[PDB]
Amino acid sequence: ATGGYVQQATGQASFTMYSGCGSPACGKAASGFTAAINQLAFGSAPGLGAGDACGRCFALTGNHDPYSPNYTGPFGQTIVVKVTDLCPVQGDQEFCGQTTSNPTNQHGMPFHFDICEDTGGSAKFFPSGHGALTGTFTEVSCSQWSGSDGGQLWNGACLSGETAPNWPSTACGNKGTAPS
Ligand SMILES: OC[C@H]1O[C@@H](O[C@H]2[C@H](O)[C@@H](O)[C@H](O[C@H]3[C@H](O)[C@@H](O)[C@H](O[C@H]4[C@H](O)[C@@H](O)[C@H](O[C@H]5[C@H](O)[C@@H](O)[C@@H](O)O[C@@H]5CO)O[C@@H]4CO)O[C@@H]3CO)O[C@@H]2CO)[C@H](O)[C@@H](O)[C@@H]1O
Ligand SMILES: OC[C@H]1O[C@@H](O[C@H]2[C@H](O)[C@@H](O)[C@H](O[C@H]3[C@H](O)[C@@H](O)[C@H](O[C@H]4[C@H](O)[C@@H](O)[C@H](O[C@H]5[C@H](O)[C@@H](O)[C@H](O)O[C@@H]5CO)O[C@@H]4CO)O[C@@H]3CO)O[C@@H]2CO)[C@H](O)[C@@H](O)[C@@H]1O
Ligand SMILES: CC(CCO)CCO
Ligand SMILES: CC(CCO)CCO
Ligand SMILES: CC(CCO)CCO
């Protein structure tokens, strides 16, 4: 996409959980299940506000535990998240360090979703004792996502991806150039 960001509607991803998604990089939180996506897909950098991932909805499915490769299941449910946040290339390497020259993380995954625990998404997705997984994602209509957006936290906040056709398309837009 514009800026060199790698923004595909479907693919393979790794998955983790995180706390504290109420002040996220898109500038609006949401009450439904939400995630941060790795910088190369988010479409912005820390401090620059929203990228084109903001507001888009994705169905996430875990199908492997990379730390326990002998584990065959059960995995969690498929969930639909709204992307509200950035998992930055600086400070979140093993999982979110994908760049244009090295587009996969340490698990060989070209995307990463950090699923917010606060609002319940991670409890639906991660079995007890298995808090990091790999699997798939597919962008879906936000008709498939339950929840309500939060209020704008600063000027330029954006979740307009929530009404956009799937990538390739432009809603909030990308900021600057993707990490190299
Ligand atoms: O930066 C992104 C994001 O990270 C968030 O934290 C992540 C963290 O990055 C990630 O490394 C961490 O991964 C945990 C994982 O959640 C947990 O399930 C896993 O537990 C393993 C355990 O390590 C193994 O010892 C155990 O092996 C057993 C075998 O299963 C069994 O068959 C037998 O062989 O005995 C073995 C020993 O008991 O399996 C467990 C399950 O696989 O350990 C990983 C490494 O610590 O996950 C967290 C949370 O997602 C962070 O919160 C966020 O803020 C940040 O943005
Ligand atoms: O008034 C001056 C100027 O302001 C502009 O608006 C600014 C606004 O002032 C800033 O507060 C705002 O800052 C946001 C950053 O742009 C955004 O990158 C950052 O995103 C964080 C997110 O908060 C955080 O949850 C996320 O955490 C990941 C962590 O890295 C992990 O440790 C954690 O566990 O898990 C998550 C998921 O992986 O990281 C990101 C990235 O650091 O959030 C800030 C607060 O919302 O930026 C605005 C835009 O520049 C305004 O637009 C101008 O008009 C005005 O003049
Ligand atoms: C070929 C595309 C899906 C159909 O529009 C790739 C999605 O990013
Ligand atoms: C859980 C929500 C309560 C207000 O709707 C906010 C989470 O961002
Ligand atoms: C995360 C657990 C409950 C599903 O919501 C795994 C059970 O499959």
Side-chain angles (χ1 to χ4, degrees):
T2 298
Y5 293 98
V6 179
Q7 290 175 328
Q8 296 175 316
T10 189
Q12 289 174 255
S14 45
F15 302 106
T16 52
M17 67 179 78
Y18 79 110
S19 296
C21 61
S23 302
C26 299
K28 292 182 173 185
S31 66
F33 301 158
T34 62
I37 201 174
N38 64 288
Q39 188 165 333
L40 184 61
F42 184 76
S44 190
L48 302 184
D52 201 63
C54 288
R56 296 179 180 275
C57 295
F58 299 86
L60 310 185
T61 305
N63 62 22
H64 183 55
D65 180 343
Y67 294 98
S68 290
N70 299 321
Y71 184 75
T72 59
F75 296 99
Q77 294 183 7
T78 291
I79 68 168
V80 178
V81 299
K82 180 170 290 185
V83 171
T84 63
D85 205 4
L86 166 63
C87 186
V89 293
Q90 303 160 304
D92 289 281
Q93 289 290 333
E94 171 181 4
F95 290 109
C96 296
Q98 301 90 340
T99 65
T100 56
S101 74
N102 194 344
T104 59
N105 66 19
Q106 296 182 8
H107 297 269
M109 294 294 97
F111 299 88
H112 187 77
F113 291 81
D114 203 9
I115 301 164
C116 187
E117 191 276 347
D118 307 358
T119 48
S122 64
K124 285 285 176 178
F125 189 81
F126 294 105
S128 180
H130 302 264
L133 299 172
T134 68
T136 60
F137 67 96
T138 294
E139 194 179 353
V140 296
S141 174
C142 292
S143 69
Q144 305 300 288
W145 177 79
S146 177
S148 304
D149 294 352
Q152 160 171 307
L153 301 173
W154 30 263
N155 202 31
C158 184
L159 291 176
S160 71
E162 70 201 357
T163 56
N166 290 347
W167 283 323
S169 64
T170 301
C172 299
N174 296 328
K175 311 296 184 283
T177 298
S180 301

